[PDB]
């Protein structure tokens, strides 16, 4: 290792793998919300949204949720039993706005994921639109 | 408030839901639905109490039998289909008081919430999602 040291920068953003090339990006700054990024070429044309696309990310979701990265906006963490509308902007590697994911988790049991390409945020928006905090 | 905005009715056909709550129809096309409270009893937002859901469920389900909300696609809202459905509600002055959110799970049960923090995009339309 001789000579100089590696340093790790502070970065904006950092990315948590949910796997299907998938990332959550989890915002230093906690005022700021969590995006999603697709690394994946097979999902690289938005135009063309397949089933192997709702199929991915119900993995990245599932993924999300097991690790507990969402709370609700009383800072309780989002628990089995609690329902929701949530909303993320999905951007590629280079940080271009690709769409918006809708998660509308109903139940325990399912959720409902649409991906709405017209749909922008506004700057002072969080990620819920709307929740319920269940059993 | 005795009177709406100018700049409102120039606007908007409202379209009475009951409960002192309209439906805000824009004459333009491409603009979005709001919707209007007109009941004292609910002017104040920060307090909102259990007559507001109450109201607020008899104005959606009005709201539901005129048939008024029509997916992009131009299908008309029919039971059976699911959605998240958005809208602001503003006073007779036009002043925003919250943001209705709108889940339709089947052909029983809905959620209503208000967001008083969620603020729209010029650009949205009224619909987050939905399913036929």
């Known amino acids: 290792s001789i000579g100089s040291n590696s340093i790790d920068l502070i970065t904006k953003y950092e990315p948590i793998f949910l796997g299907s090339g998938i990332y959550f990006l989890r915002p230093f700054n906690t005022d700021e919300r969590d995006k999603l990024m697709v690394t994946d070429n097979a999902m690289s044309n938005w135009d063309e949204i397949t089933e192997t696309y709702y199929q991915k990310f119900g993995n990245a979701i599932n993924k999300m949720l097991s690790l507990r990265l969402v709370s609700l906006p009383n800072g309780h963490i989002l628990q089995p039993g609690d329902s ?49 905090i269940g059993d």
Do not use: H, P
């Open 84 to 132: 929701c509308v949530w909303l993320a902007e999905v951007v590629d590697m280079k940080d271009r706005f690709q769409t918006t994911l809708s998660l509308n988790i109903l139940n325990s049991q399912r959720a409902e994921i649409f991906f709405n390409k017209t749909f922008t945020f506004n700057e002072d928006n969080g990620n819920f639109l709307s929740y319920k």
